[PDB]
Amino acid sequence: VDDAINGLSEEQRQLRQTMAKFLQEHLAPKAQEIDRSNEFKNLREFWKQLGNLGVLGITAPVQYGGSGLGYLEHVLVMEEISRASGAVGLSYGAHSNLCINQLVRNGNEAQKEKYLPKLISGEYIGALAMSEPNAGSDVVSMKLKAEKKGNHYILNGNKFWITNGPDADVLIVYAKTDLAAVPASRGITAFIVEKGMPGFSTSKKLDKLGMRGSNTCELIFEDCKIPAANILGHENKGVYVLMSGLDLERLVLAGGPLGLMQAVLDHTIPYLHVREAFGQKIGHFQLMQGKMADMYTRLMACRQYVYNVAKACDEGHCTAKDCAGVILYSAECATQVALDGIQCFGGNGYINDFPMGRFLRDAKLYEIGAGTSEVRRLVIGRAFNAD
Amino acid sequence: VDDAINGLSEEQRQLRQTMAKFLQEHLAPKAQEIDRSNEFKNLREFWKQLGNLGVLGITAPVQYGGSGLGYLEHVLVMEEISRASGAVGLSYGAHSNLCINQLVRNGNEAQKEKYLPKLISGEYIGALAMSEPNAGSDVVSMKLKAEKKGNHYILNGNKFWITNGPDADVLIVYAKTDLAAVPASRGITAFIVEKGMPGFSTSKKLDKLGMRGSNTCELIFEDCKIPAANILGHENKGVYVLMSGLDLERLVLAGGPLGLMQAVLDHTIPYLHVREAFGQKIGHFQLMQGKMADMYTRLMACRQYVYNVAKACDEGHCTAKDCAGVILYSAECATQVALDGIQCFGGNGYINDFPMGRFLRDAKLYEIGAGTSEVRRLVIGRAFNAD
Amino acid sequence: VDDAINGLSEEQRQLRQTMAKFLQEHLAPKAQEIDRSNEFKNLREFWKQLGNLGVLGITAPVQYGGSGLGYLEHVLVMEEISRASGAVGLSYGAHSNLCINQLVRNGNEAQKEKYLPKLISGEYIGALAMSEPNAGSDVVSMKLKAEKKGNHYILNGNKFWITNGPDADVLIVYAKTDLAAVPASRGITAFIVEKGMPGFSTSKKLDKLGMRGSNTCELIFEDCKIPAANILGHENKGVYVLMSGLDLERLVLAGGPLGLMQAVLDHTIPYLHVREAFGQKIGHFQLMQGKMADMYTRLMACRQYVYNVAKACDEGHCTAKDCAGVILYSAECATQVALDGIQCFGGNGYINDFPMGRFLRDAKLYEIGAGTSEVRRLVIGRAFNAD
Amino acid sequence: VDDAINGLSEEQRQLRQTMAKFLQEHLAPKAQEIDRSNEFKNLREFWKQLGNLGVLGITAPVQYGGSGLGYLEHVLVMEEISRASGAVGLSYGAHSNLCINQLVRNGNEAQKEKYLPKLISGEYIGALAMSEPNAGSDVVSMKLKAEKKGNHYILNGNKFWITNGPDADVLIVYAKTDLAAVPASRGITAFIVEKGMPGFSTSKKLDKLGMRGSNTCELIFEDCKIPAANILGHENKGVYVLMSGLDLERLVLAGGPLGLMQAVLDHTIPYLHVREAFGQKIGHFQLMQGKMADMYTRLMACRQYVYNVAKACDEGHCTAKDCAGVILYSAECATQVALDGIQCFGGNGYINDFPMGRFLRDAKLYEIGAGTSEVRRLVIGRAFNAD
Ligand SMILES: Cc1cc2nc3c(=O)[nH]c(=O)nc-3n(C[C@H](O)[C@H](O)[C@H](O)COP(=O)(O)OP(=O)(O)OC[C@H]3O[C@@H](n4cnc5c(N)ncnc54)[C@H](O)[C@@H]3O)c2cc1C
Ligand SMILES: Cc1cc2nc3c(=O)[nH]c(=O)nc-3n(C[C@H](O)[C@H](O)[C@H](O)COP(=O)(O)OP(=O)(O)OC[C@H]3O[C@@H](n4cnc5c(N)ncnc54)[C@H](O)[C@@H]3O)c2cc1C
Ligand SMILES: Cc1cc2nc3c(=O)[nH]c(=O)nc-3n(C[C@H](O)[C@H](O)[C@H](O)COP(=O)(O)OP(=O)(O)OC[C@H]3O[C@@H](n4cnc5c(N)ncnc54)[C@H](O)[C@@H]3O)c2cc1C
Ligand SMILES: Cc1cc2nc3c(=O)[nH]c(=O)nc-3n(C[C@H](O)[C@H](O)[C@H](O)COP(=O)(O)OP(=O)(O)OC[C@H]3O[C@@H](n4cnc5c(N)ncnc54)[C@H](O)[C@@H]3O)c2cc1C
């Protein structure tokens, strides 16, 4: 049970409640299996069901079936889906926030009419590829080379850490078009790869600590022909598209840790008042009361920060400093909240029959696998150095 | 330079700008001396100026010369005054929040038309006395005994930790009327004492670590005859008025830790781009960048939390759990940020010529003074036990 | 490469090096499988080899096959075994410390000659059973009943959280002997149970977050007949033998987190000088350098504290306050050190192919399992109170 | 009361007992006045008594009056003197460690008899000048020009943060003898400035947040003539002296925070069993018990670390990163311990009539003064990339 202190309107509260209701029956009872089997068998049907609620294209234009709402509703949906399951939350983020929004921002008429319709309805799954086995933070150091042989581009290289890679029908891959660039940043271009393109293949899904179920794999390009129309933006200006939405991307990414902390609380608060020790509830001891208070305060502070920054980006004033600070705070507080959740459960939180360990294993992903806290700190630092 | 991300209206932004200009012109240049001499020799003139500005009754009805605004504007004014001077911020909070709001909630019309006008105009200074030498947290265990004699009450005892005691003309003390109450709670009565009442005196001001300038002393009552009309609320019900506005009090007192953090930032950020080491600005090393990011994110999160909780209490939904969590989080983060503001200043942060140490010495009070962190943690905990 | 600053002798360093050489070829290369399969297929033969090395009875008398050494050597062996695999380290701590030492302290000549030889040689595996499905911290609220039937005892009940349960041949179980004692403490007795006893069985091994491979199950007693000679200590005096070594148990169990921290450091430090970002090694950036410094300082402090307390308990001066503080500090620092180590690997630190996640999942047991941080904190606080 | 878990010999126990018995009579009763007046009125007589005791030249040969002991006995005296007064402890660390060890290490037979025989007895007070108003951490970026004009050197410039300056008779200063070196590291030389030399002047005392009583000032040299025989080491090789006086300078300065933590504990533990709240001693509450436990464990871990690193340095094994980590841990733990002690004292911990605020204000110097947390972290990090 959340509060009205967040400042949500009725429309946003109705959305949050509907998403919670849908997840409690369609995603919540499966979170334990998805993590155990490291697979989401109903991924396609769950996507088709999410595309019927209008949350996939929550921010895309209504012209292509989207809802046309702001980024606060997107953060709410992300928080709910991550409260139901972290892996599916990360998948929804990679699909609707990294791929769809990138196309509505930089996609031209033909591409937006070809891909978005099926991307907002759930027929296609989306993925974004800007990381390599040797370039995860030094993104400009990618080693996927695309050479223009006339009206086509021959792509060769590898891409790693691609969420929804083995299930995505449309992918946005950044390939180095000219290694001889004055800055390297001016030598990368964005390409739209489709499933079935000769020369494009995927690797075996990764076995990760947490967020198991969000299929991450490697993209192998062996002389892959990409038409000249399948370029997002312009040639050699791929960094423009790469950085155009990074702030709004880290903004929506902050919803995952919020949902994980909410789930941790939803299991810690009731358990502490049922389990008893020394003749009284364990949730009545001063230490556990202070732990609960600290967890609740951290969760509420992060929630208010993220929601305020989201409302701000919805009005016109949207910066990188705050979009990075929100995620730096949320991803760093979620791990401590998860640790406290396991410490509150004790011996029962250490067995994989309770979801206390999954929350911890999933909250660390946002710290080292979706942008590092070190890079988010330096972003704010350099934003202060430029003023 | 504050950001329009917290969701402030045009009128609130203009109020903040006016307060900042007035404090930069009249209060800020003296903040260093008020702490050196442990006295604000222009206290009454500054109070009259604040009353002419209309911020001493920011939350008081317009019937008594107040502004009649919400608690968000009160938090803004407190934050600004504490950004200028923490001791004067505490003195203003002990006059407008602990005293003026205590009279517009449990005071009859006669007690209001007599004290509130001059308390809002700046002629009278206000103080609250609900703590004793042996009762800091266990406020229910008082030793200031008030025995009725006809239509008057003979008060005898001592009260400790009374802000503005030496300067207050109207103080709200809590004496113990019924020394037979099975619940001590209903054995306390609130009395409105005035400077000059025979049998009421004050001790010498305290010499505290920080907040030097907010005159705190001990009140002595020796056969103090108080009329039966100078009693706040109903006799033997002096815990209802004590808890009637404790949540709003903790909310309005959360601005001090906000102003202190904003002040340490306004000295750390400009200083890290004027000081150089190893040939480059010290604000360019990754360690200082991470420290800046951490403190800025903490300040922003605390600001969003407290501002949203204040906006909630101005709409009819005002809870005690969040009103305690905000103050706890803000008091902790303010000390944590002040400890990193002295580290970003090097040896210059250890000399009393720079304001870095004063910020820490003033922020520690919000953690140990004006309510303890353990009490707030236990309140937040017991807010879950009853559910 | 550990530092010889803790103050070890030449024989202690020889033991450290021998155990390291043995475990770098017999245990270390299997740690990834043991955690993946949740089973140590070579448990019995590895135990026979460990007993041939002379560390299973490192603190047992030479008369029964032990080594007659102190507790510092026990801590060193525990650390060296947990450095290669935390699960096998916990199993070694459960057998060599909670079972053997308990029998050499409280056992009689017959009990010391019937079990200790094979317990030290490796033929027999040992376990200790005090915890129950509803008594983890409240160790005097057990629900295992033992009714005296002439010269025998009929045991009925169950026990939970028992290390080496499915593999143990000699177990020490605490059962309630009188349900009418003024303090419950006076109605508990220890019993030496042997595998193959009519009326004793075990449950399926638990699927735990970490320490996978250290078989932990539930002991089911259904009218189990235990002779009277199998009583460990004296009937109705079970808490005296349960608290006779709790201090030394907490002391020796502190080596686990030390080994886990040493392992995460040995895996991180070399990785920071190979991985390259932005041209230079990632270990040349100030943030990673500070993280390495913090991890190294925490590890060194924990090691010094544990080793000094172990040297102290070996000379006659041994206290519960320090034996609890060492384990509390080590377990609380190991989790943060493993978190930062995962933070030092990036995406590679989130895939199960690297051992960074296993370290975090194992270090968390020493804060919830084998004791909790709150119990040790309260023990220290009450030791302070008793002064 | 100290516990003999550190592994101290009988001689060291007796030394600590004597130091405590002396400081409880001659230094402890006057610490509050020393902090208030920012001056020690019995500095010379106290020093001479400390020389008659024999703990000034503790780590110095017996020839010149020293005791001929190790660095552990030296850390013991530093801890015991900072336990009674942090400012006098810093002054003693500046005179006994930064002026006498540097003289026995890099001093000739002529210099080791003109100054040392009266620096070990207390007649002369010692200081060291490596910090200037423009370089505290970039200690290579000194600006103090020394011109060789035959049989003398002419010094011109200014220095800053000089403990014992206003009272030191001998000062080991550093000056740029060659401002055109390829590395600026080799353009520096050390000199022995004796008080009274024409040209050398001391500025006015500093008004610091803490350590009030340890007089600090600026060193102004305006054409100051120094004989060539007063050269410490050799010409244009002053970085060698500065780096030789670095590891054993960071090691011994770790007793300061240890003594401050011990002092805060000696006031918190007895005060939490006398103060009453809610009808019981505040020392019996779970939160206060956990605070006491955490403080005791941190103090004990820091003590074990510092004393083990000092025992390894008394047998030959010294390491830069270990001596930088001991203090990095001790100083960072002392501030938290002082904050927790102030929290445990409550309102009484905010008035200057209690020594908690003094402990806090003094524990922050070791994090900014005598080095920085960032510098020590970066040193420890720079100790790994080299392997
Ligand atoms: C759509 C998408 C989905 C992804 N999903 C996942 C996923 O589910 N899981 C996953 O693990 N990854 C995922 N990734 C990849 C993830 O973003 C990268 O792994 C991450 O950026 C860091 O990976 P790395 O190991 O290459 O970083 P590294 O550079 O190898 O990290 C080394 C360490 O050094 C630090 N560091 C690096 N450079 C600097 C510097 N200049 N200054 C200071 N510190 C520095 C880093 O913060 C880190 O702690 C995904 C990427 C994309 C595009
Ligand atoms: C208008 C006004 C102004 C004031 N101004 C000041 C001021 O300027 N400066 C100032 O110092 N004080 C001031 N006070 C008093 C301040 O509120 C108290 O100092 C504070 O509540 C702590 O009380 P104490 O000093 O008696 O400490 P105690 O409460 O006696 O301290 C005991 C310690 O134990 C803890 N504790 C108490 N109960 C429990 C429990 N049940 N469980 C666990 N821990 C517990 C406390 O948190 C504290 O850490 C003021 C009060 C009023 C009404
Ligand atoms: C030989 C042996 C081996 C074991 N091996 C394992 C193992 O491998 N894995 C494993 O998971 N477990 C193991 N256990 C169980 C472990 O010891 C318990 O899990 C632990 O002691 C307490 O957790 P709990 O869930 O049983 O108790 P709970 O009471 O449910 O603990 C819940 C939380 O409440 C807190 N709490 C309880 N009382 C108080 C109080 N008065 N004040 C403040 N806080 C309080 C606890 O500290 C804990 O954080 C083992 C036990 C034994 C005897
Ligand atoms: C006899 C004697 C007495 C002394 N007394 C004192 C005393 O009373 N107080 C005291 O504080 N010191 C004292 N010192 C030591 C010296 O004054 C301190 O080091 C002082 O802090 C000087 O540093 P600064 O503030 O000028 O550094 P600044 O450069 O002014 O500080 C800038 C800040 O950025 C950090 N920083 C700088 N460079 C880097 C980098 N490359 N990467 C990351 N972070 C960086 C800092 O360490 C610092 O927090 C004394 C020394 C001696 C020999």
Side-chain angles (χ1 to χ4, degrees), chain A residues 90 94 98 127-138 160-163 208 211 214 216 365 368-375 378 382, chain B residues 286, chain C residues 271 275-278 282 285-288 291 342-348 350-351:
Chain A
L90 189 76
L98 305 188
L128 186 102
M130 56 98 196
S131 291
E132 306 239 353
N134 302 87
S137 296
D138 186 7
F160 206 44
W161 309 110
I162 315 311
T163 294
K208 315 193 291 289
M211 310 271 249
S214 186
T216 316
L365 186 273
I368 44 72
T372 63
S373 292
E374 287 76 39
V375 172
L378 300 172
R382 293 157 188 160
Chain B
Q286 299 193 357
Chain C
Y271 181 83
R275 183 68 168 174
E276 286 138 17
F278 302 90
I282 59 163
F285 289 114
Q286 280 192 357
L287 303 173
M288 300 274 109
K291 222 175 267 292
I342 290 167
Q343 185 64 229
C344 284
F345 260 79
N348 282 336
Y350 203 72
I351 56 173

Side-chain angles (χ1 to χ4, degrees), chain B residues 271 275 277-278 282 285 287-288 343-348, chain C residues 286, chain D residues 128 130-131 136-137 161-163 208 216 365 368-372 374 378:
Chain B
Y271 178 85
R275 179 77 180 187
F278 302 92
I282 60 168
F285 290 102
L287 284 175
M288 298 280 108
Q343 191 68 241
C344 290
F345 258 78
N348 283 317
Chain C
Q286 280 192 357
Chain D
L128 186 126
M130 59 136 266
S131 304
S137 324
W161 319 105
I162 315 303
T163 289
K208 307 166 282 175
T216 305
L365 178 79
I368 59 102
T372 73
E374 301 96 48
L378 294 183

Side-chain angles (χ1 to χ4, degrees), chain C residues 199-245:
Chain C
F200 166 55
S201 198
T202 67
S203 188
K204 195 184 39 172
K205 55 161 86 155
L206 290 159
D207 202 72
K208 317 190 291 299
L209 164 71
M211 299 302 197
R212 298 167 56 77
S214 181
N215 297 327
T216 309
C217 74
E218 161 171 37
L219 279 35
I220 301 155
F221 294 90
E222 293 177 350
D223 293 316
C224 188
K225 210 173 238 300
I226 310 284
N230 274 112
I231 296 167
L232 181 54
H234 305 289
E235 61 281 307
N236 294 125
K237 305 198 168 226
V239 295
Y240 290 142
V241 306
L242 184 136
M243 307 286 207
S244 268

Side-chain angles (χ1 to χ4, degrees), chain A residues 308-327:
Chain A
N308 279 16
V309 172
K311 289 185 209 110
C313 285
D314 282 349
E315 303 266 22
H317 174 94
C318 185
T319 63
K321 210 172 30 170
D322 296 304
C323 288
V326 293
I327 181 65

